Amino acid sequence: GLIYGNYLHLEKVLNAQELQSETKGNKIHDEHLFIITHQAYELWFKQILWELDSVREIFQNGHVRDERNMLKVVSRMHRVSVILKLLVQQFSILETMTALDFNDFREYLSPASGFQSLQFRLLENKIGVLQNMRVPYNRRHYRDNFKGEENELLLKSEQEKTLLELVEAWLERTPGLEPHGFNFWGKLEKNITRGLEEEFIRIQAEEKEEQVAEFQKQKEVLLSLFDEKRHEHLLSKGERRLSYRALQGALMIYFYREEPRFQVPFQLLTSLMDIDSLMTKWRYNHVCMVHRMLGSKAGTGGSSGYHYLRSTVSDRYKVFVDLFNLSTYLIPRHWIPKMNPTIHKFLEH
Amino acid sequence: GLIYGNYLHLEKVLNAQELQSETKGNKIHDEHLFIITHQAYELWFKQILWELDSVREIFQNGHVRDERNMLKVVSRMHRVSVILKLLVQQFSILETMTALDFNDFREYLSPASGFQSLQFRLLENKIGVLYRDNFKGEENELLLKSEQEKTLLELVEAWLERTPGLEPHGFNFWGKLEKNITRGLEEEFQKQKEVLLSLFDEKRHEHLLSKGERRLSYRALQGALMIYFYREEPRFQVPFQLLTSLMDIDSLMTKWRYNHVCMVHRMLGSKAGTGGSSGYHYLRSTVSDRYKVFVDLFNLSTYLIPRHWIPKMNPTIHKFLEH
Amino acid sequence: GLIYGNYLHLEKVLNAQELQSETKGNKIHDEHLFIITHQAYELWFKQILWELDSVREIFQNGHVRDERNMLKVVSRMHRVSVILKLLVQQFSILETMTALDFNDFREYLSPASGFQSLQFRLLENKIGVLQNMRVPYNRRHYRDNFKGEENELLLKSEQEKTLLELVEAWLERTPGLEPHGFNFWGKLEKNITRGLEEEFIRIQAKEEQVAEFQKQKEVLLSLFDEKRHEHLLSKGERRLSYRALQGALMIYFYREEPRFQVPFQLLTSLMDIDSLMTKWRYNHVCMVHRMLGSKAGTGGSSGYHYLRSTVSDRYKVFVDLFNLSTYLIPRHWIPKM
Amino acid sequence: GLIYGNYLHLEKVLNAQELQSETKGNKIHDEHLFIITHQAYELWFKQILWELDSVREIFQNGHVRDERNMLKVVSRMHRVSVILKLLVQQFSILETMTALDFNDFREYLSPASGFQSLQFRLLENKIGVLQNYRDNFKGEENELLLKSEQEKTLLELVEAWLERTPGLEPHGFNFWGKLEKNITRGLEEEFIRIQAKEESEEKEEQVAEFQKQKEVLLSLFDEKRHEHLLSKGERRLSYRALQGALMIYFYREEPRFQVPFQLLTSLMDIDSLMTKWRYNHVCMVHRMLGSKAGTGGSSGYHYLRSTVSDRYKVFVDLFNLSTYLIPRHWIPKM
Ligand code: HEM
Ligand code: HEM
Ligand code: HEM
Ligand code: HEM
Ligand SMILES: N[C@@H](Cc1c[nH]c2ccccc12)C(=O)O
Ligand SMILES: N[C@@H](Cc1c[nH]c2ccccc12)C(=O)O
Ligand SMILES: N[C@@H](Cc1c[nH]c2ccccc12)C(=O)O
Ligand SMILES: N[C@@H](Cc1c[nH]c2ccccc12)C(=O)O
Ligand SMILES: N[C@@H](Cc1c[nH]c2ccccc12)C(=O)O
Ligand SMILES: N[C@@H](Cc1c[nH]c2ccccc12)C(=O)O
Ligand SMILES: N[C@@H](Cc1c[nH]c2ccccc12)C(=O)O
Ligand SMILES: N[C@@H](Cc1c[nH]c2ccccc12)C(=O)O
């Protein structure tokens, strides 16, 4: 007969708390809070990876093509986002430890650090952090912190398809992009040209000289969206992550989100942004706690400490930057290519 | 030397997830979340036990008498509050599991249930909640001892009885208080008068104690009111924070029970639980003041009077209640 | 050009703070907190009403029929829940006021109370709380607080279609229920009857299980008892029509089918809102207990004891959505498509 | 008789919502959310100002000297951080507005913006955000803003109180003189240990780390270095207020120091939460605008990112004192 403790394997979970300060002569009371906190984070990291891998598989094995699977995909991605909120507020518990009491056992931690968290790196990689985009500390690649089987695992996570790459391929298949079909991009380029011209004609008919200047730059940006060569250049700089065609699909889903087939997909894209946003907030809440804990002391793990972490709060680690930056090309509602009754029907369940 | 995963014994923590649906033929994806969620709770239960026992020990070994320890005491108790708030919020994660998906692996859980959580019971007992069939062997022992050892309620109680100002040949708070309330009432209804004076009925209080309506002794109650009214006095400041934290822990506990109820409702409807209870209904009954260990601290708000009525503290007792 | 303060009408919002303790002689510092806190609850009440009326309108005027609008409906209802979530937590700001400090200005408040909040009642009604659902004290006093224009709005909020009623009509049109078509209810009764029979066979092949089985057979088959449904629909155990219940269950079982994906989100949101309204009632209670103890309320209720009575399923407008969990069956039994 | 709606002045509060999009024809449903959200923020800003001024007065009028008042001071300061935490969470509400729906009424907002929030500026100044923006303000509002720059800030008031911390006096406990003495000996003893070790790469690694540590620790006792950093703005507290804060950190368990230590912790909490407000703000603004310039004239997203830095952290020094934490046995005995 199943027993709660055995089902949950608490004989392992609740016998995993060894205070290094205890195993060295003077246990420091607050080291217990320190271990439990990290262990709770790591248990949730594992859950995130579980969801994340299942969603990667759904894309990879072709099942995302069958649109009855979108509810499951969006519901699991949103769950990753919900766990991450919890992880962001979880720092409030560690923050009840003063820096003085932390100071009483910090000496027993060296040279271990969060640099040695296998799962945090797995998670970064599987979402789609580019290894060359990573802020360096001590002049070498992050994987130097791992050896053997763990190193092997990390390498596979750098090599296997990332959430970013999977979502990208799917985005490239978004209905409506086909030039000989609805031809979204063609119609969009045309409609933006018209809009601008009607807008310029309206303007030229202090405010004027300014509105002209304001017009002139909005025009450059909007029209630059159709410069594919410019995009390719920004791709290789890692300034952009998505392929030109994938950007098109994403924009297609933004504009026509209310169309029934695009409603859950638009929720997914929103979730992808949520997850980028939560991950960075995790980083920043981390940074704020570490400032109070260390001041400007160097880290047990070999970094500058507070200062290094601060530099990781940046778009370098924002995998779906392209989804955020699409808001740059938002246009007036009536500029958006109208849908005929055939494609309106194409995009119905 | 030391490595992250070894340090945290991730070898154990991250190798502790066995889907009962998987070992039984058809693995259900959402059972992983079900397992991880309970494991995170238990970890935090263990942390709470760790803080709680450490605070009980400070009361027990006499260190609480040394008032330089109050900061340690309040801060650890506040920490318990903070952890509990996260635990209340943590239900929102499990709530991303639809009842339908839950329904796909629930069959593999019987007869197990939360009734078998050792740490939850240890928690309730050590705080002062006044089922053990669900345990036996060595676990029944710890459970036994947690009922027999002095509770947080009893330890706070004794400490509350030693509160300065409560001695009849000293500042005589209680005598002075009955005088000022007898005066102020007749200076000024019958219903408030009835209630306010019943505070001075020690006999009524003892009767309510045995009835279980009240937990703290009469004397301990007096110290608590003394700390409320004079909380700004330096020696009472951190003690007042402590009383506040005790009340915090009480609310968060039932808020835990209640968020639990709301989720279980959506998961089970009116089905009976795997542990043999009526389920939702049974859980609804635990969200009551029967489980509120520090009810008296809440109830004291009944007897709050105008500032004027409060026994003026002369310069003698003022300098005494200075650090 | 417009300016922030003017745009937001801050000349109204930030000039709305009058400390009654200050008006009557002695300013008590924490009354400001007290005031701002309610004002913020009411701004959000207004917002909730705004989302809510607009979703009601989408149902009422037929727009929901075009499923293009389902993203809007679910986004706004989920928005209502996100706001309620914030409002549950907002109590922690007022909890930084000790009971002893509150007691220094409580006297200047009587006989006014939260009981006189028009928007809270509007919200209750527009979601769908019926007069019968209300606690006896509340039923004969909630409307006896307002007059004229406010009383006008209250009557409307009850006379007009509720979210409950509107969602009920729409659930009744759930594709799949039509007997000439997919005949969901017919297939379901057949499959469950077959399932129970296979199950009873398995248990006979092997004392507790037969007893468990029997209770479960009793409950499941009872689902198909429409008369029982109406009887319960009169003791107030149930609120939704029979057919609407079938639509809800249809959306649960077939939630992955694309036309049901967003509808399923909506039912979940509906339950979220119910939960969060009660968690609001309960956080409220927990606070008030520490503020009043056993003292009666300024509005004349018993205080703690009364408020605690509102933390009841009798106030859950969508109880049925919760209670359909009672009737969940193994995947295998669900009628195939 | 007093009535709820009247008490709260809801005739003002619930009649303050004017959708500009509506005023110009096409009502956009989400503009209402946008308005209510900002209005809620401003009510909470007002509450913060209220609490914050009350605490400033306690200091300014000398009431902090009477230590009866420390419970009030800390509880109100803690109250401020509890409000700020809600304000940070409050962004999640506005985040249920998509960028495309925001786009439908954004044009009606120009040229208003958060630059024109009076209360947010007052908040910054009163806490003590160093000057080195009033363009967006005029008239009486401009006046108030000046007054907030000239009146004593929370930072300045806490600084003065820290300068009066008991224990600092040289002919009394002489905390600083003793602290320097013990640090110097502590390091010299640590250095003896390292020297004893056998010549290795590890030993040199320990010597090298030691030297870096010794230099940092002992620079605590360089007052000229501190003054130089003050002038550069890289620091904010006087040298002596720093000694007081350190005194309170080290001896926090001493009864007279318990609640003051809570106070200092609360200050760091508020810095931490202000910057978390700015960053949550940033994250939302990126989804809303991408790289479009703000209606208020800034570059937008890029500008807001720059406000998320220690340039705005009023109590940096309280954070940076963790740089000088030492082993317990080096702390001067009482
Ligand atoms: C007192 C509390 C903490 C301190 C002082 C601290 C400090 C640091 C420091 C200084 C680093 C940079 C590496 C180094 O030089 O050591 C770091 C990295 C890291 N820490 Fe923390 N940390 C704390 C709490 C936590 C917690 C609770 C977690 C939960 C898993 C965590 C996870 C990580 C991770 C994943 C990294 C790598 C981050 C990256 O490179 O982006 N830390 N930490
Ligand atoms: C889908 C989620 C859950 C369901 C359906 C559920 C259901 C139940 C039920 C029906 C009971 C009463 C005993 C029984 O008949 O089995 C119970 C008890 C209990 N469960 Fe949960 N539960 C859930 C999640 C959790 C979680 C995540 C925890 C975290 C540790 C937890 C901890 C407890 C505790 C401590 C009790 C005993 C409570 C008391 O007696 O006051 N449960 N649960
Ligand atoms: C110190 C804080 C509070 C106390 C002591 C308190 C107390 C009470 C009491 C006693 C009642 C019952 C009516 C009566 O007899 O007066 C009540 C009802 C109510 N209050 Fe509060 N309250 C507090 C804060 C709030 C806040 C912040 C709100 C936010 C809007 C609020 C809104 C309401 C509402 C809507 C009702 C009617 C509830 C129902 O009928 O279910 N109250 N309150
Ligand atoms: C869709 C939502 C929002 C957007 C797109 C947005 C955008 C911006 C931008 C672009 C600026 C820089 C000035 C400019 O060029 O306009 C700014 C500043 C500011 N905003 Fe927001 N904002 C939003 C919501 C809010 C909310 C809810 C508040 C609450 C009061 C707020 C308060 C402020 C404040 C106080 C500033 C000045 C901050 C500083 O200069 O450090 N904003 N905002
Ligand atoms: N489901 C189809 C079509 C598709 C691709 N990307 C999409 C985005 C939104 C909606 C549909 C699609 C496929 O995967 O090939
Ligand atoms: N790197 C941290 C120490 C630390 C944080 N989390 C850890 C987990 C395990 C081991 C060490 C750590 C510091 O410099 O203070
Ligand atoms: N510390 C002393 C005095 C004391 C008892 N109870 C208190 C409550 C508040 C302040 C001081 C006390 C003791 O433990 O006996
Ligand atoms: N008692 C729960 C099952 C359950 C909840 N949490 C558990 C933890 C372990 C084992 C079983 C459970 C039910 O009736 O559905
Ligand atoms: N949208 C159609 C059909 C419908 C009713 N209820 C539904 C639930 C889910 C999907 C479609 C429907 C209508 O309103 O009449
Ligand atoms: N009913 C509350 C008083 C109260 C709570 N919230 C209010 C808002 C406005 C006016 C009065 C109130 C009591 O009995 O103490
Ligand atoms: N309260 C006294 C002494 C004092 C100043 N700073 C302190 C810090 C901690 C404890 C006491 C003090 C004063 O204001 O002058
Ligand atoms: N600054 C925002 C507009 C904005 C945000 N909050 C505001 C409050 C009032 C007026 C305008 C705003 C933008 O550039 O899009």
Look-up of token digits 């002695």: C26
Is A292 an interface residue toward D (CB < 8 Å)? yes
| DSSP H or E run through C214 | helix C208-222
The answer to whether the Cβ–Cβ distance between A281 and D286 falls below 8 Å is no
Q: Is the CB of C301 under 6 A from ligand 10?
A: no
Query: In chain D, which among 222-281 make CB contacts under 8 A with chain A?
Result: 249-250, 252, 265, 268, 272, 275-276, 279-280
Question: Which has the closest alpha carbon to C64: C174, C171, C170, C163?
Answer: C170
Residues 6+ apart with CB under 8 A from B199: B303
Structure tokens at C104: 């220094």
Domain D9-169+223-330 grouped into CATH 1.20.58.480: yes
Residue D68 CB burial class (10 angstroms; 0-12, 13-18, ≥19) = middle
Q: What is the C-alpha to C-alpha distance for residues C181 and C184, in angstroms, rounded to an integer? A: 8
Number of neighbours of residue D110 by Cβ within 10 angstroms: 14
Min CA distance, D286 vs chain A (Å)?
6
Residues 6+ apart with CB under 8 A from D84: D48, D270, D273, D274, D277
First-to-final CA distance of chain B: 46
Look-up of token digits 């303007």: A203
C-alpha B72 to ligand 11 mean position (Å): 21
Is A99 an interface residue toward D (CB < 8 Å)? yes
What lines the ligand 1 site, CB under 6 Å? Answer: A 37-38, 41, 94, 102, 113-115, 117, 120, 286, 289-290, 293-294, 299-303, 305, 308-309, 312
Distances in whole angstroms, Cα of residue A32 to Cα of each of A37, A41, A95, D126: 9, 14, 14, 39
The answer to whether the Cβ–Cβ distance between A17 and B1 falls below 8 Å is no
Which sequence spans correspond to the domains of chain C? Answer: 4-178+226-333
The answer to whether the Cβ–Cβ distance between B271 and C325 falls below 8 Å is yes
Q: What is the C-alpha to C-alpha distance for residues C33 and D51, in angstroms, rounded to an integer? A: 9
Question: Which has the closest alpha carbon to A304: A148, A122, A113, A117?
Answer: A113
The CATH code that applies to domain A4-177+227-346 is 1.20.58.480
Q: What angle do CA B141, B143, B146 make, to 5 degrees?
A: 110
Q: Are C321 and C267 in contact (CB under 8 A)?
A: yes
Q: What is the C-alpha to C-alpha distance for residues D154 and D148, in angstroms, rounded to an integer? A: 11
Which member of C2, C43, C109 has the closest CB to residue D39? C43
Look-up of token digits 């053990």: B132
Name the amino acid, one letter, at A293. Answer: M
Look up residue D297 and give its DSSP letter.
Answer: S
Is A283 an interface residue toward D (CB < 8 Å)? no
Q: Are D126 and D56 in contact (CB under 8 A)?
A: yes
* Known binding residues of A for heme: 286
Min CA distance, C259 vs chain A (Å)?
6
D278 known ligand binder:
no
C-alpha D161 to ligand 11 mean position (Å): 6
* Closest Cα to atom 6 of ligand 9: C174
Name the packing angle between helices D154-163 and D118-127 (round to 10°): 10
Structure tokens at D59: 């200091």
List the resolution, Å.
2.4
Q: Are A115 and A302 in contact (CB under 8 A)?
A: yes
Is B91 an interface residue toward C (CB < 8 Å)? no
First-to-final CA distance of chain C: 60
Question: Which has the closest alpha carbon to B121: C139, D148, A4, D280?
Answer: A4
The CATH label, of 3.40.50.970, 1.10.3720.10, 3.90.740.10, 1.20.58.480, for the domain at C4-178+226-333 is 1.20.58.480
The answer to whether the Cβ–Cβ distance between A67 and C258 falls below 8 Å is yes
Q: Are B291 and B145 in contact (CB under 8 A)?
A: no
Structure tokens at D132: 């080195």
Method: X-ray
Q: Are A130 and A102 in contact (CB under 8 A)?
A: no
Is B158 an interface residue toward A (CB < 8 Å)? no
Residues 6+ apart with CB under 8 A from B44: A36, A40, B83, B86, B87
Look-up of token digits 């620790």: D217
- C-D C-beta contacts closer than 8 Å: 158
Structure tokens at B55: 């605070």
Question: Which has the closest alpha carbon to C14: C2, C27, C3, C5?
Answer: C5
Name the amino acid, one letter, at D332. Answer: P
Q: What is the C-alpha to C-alpha distance for residues B170 and B172, in angstroms, rounded to an integer? A: 5
CA dihedral for C112, C117, C118, C121, sign (positive or negative): negative
Structure tokens at A110: 């060296």
> Which of C58, C61, C63, C64, when mutated, tests ligand 9's pocket best, judged by the most ligand atoms within 8 Å of its CB?
C64
The answer to whether the Cβ–Cβ distance between B68 and D261 falls below 8 Å is no
Name the packing angle between helices D154-163 and D255-289 (round to 10°): 160
The answer to whether the Cβ–Cβ distance between C322 and B269 falls below 8 Å is yes
Q: Is the CB of C299 under 6 A from ligand 10?
A: yes
Name the amino acid, one letter, at B162. Answer: R
* Closest Cα to atom 3 of ligand 10: C113
The answer to whether the Cβ–Cβ distance between C70 and A257 falls below 8 Å is no
Name the amino acid, one letter, at C330. Answer: P
Residue of B nearest to D255 (CA): B68
C-alpha C65 to ligand 9 mean position (Å): 6
A123 HSE (CA, 13 A, CB side): 20
Look-up of token digits 């849908």: A339
Q: Are B300 and B221 in contact (CB under 8 A)?
A: yes
Query: In chain D, which among 29-88 make CB contacts under 8 A with chain C?
Result: 29, 32-33, 35-36, 38-40, 42-44, 46-47, 50-51, 54, 75, 78-79, 82-83, 86
Q: What is the C-alpha to C-alpha distance for residues A36 and A17, in angstroms, rounded to an integer? A: 7
Residues 6+ apart with CB under 8 A from D103: A327, A330, A331, A333
Residues 6+ apart with CB under 8 A from C294: B195, B299, B302, C303, C304, C305
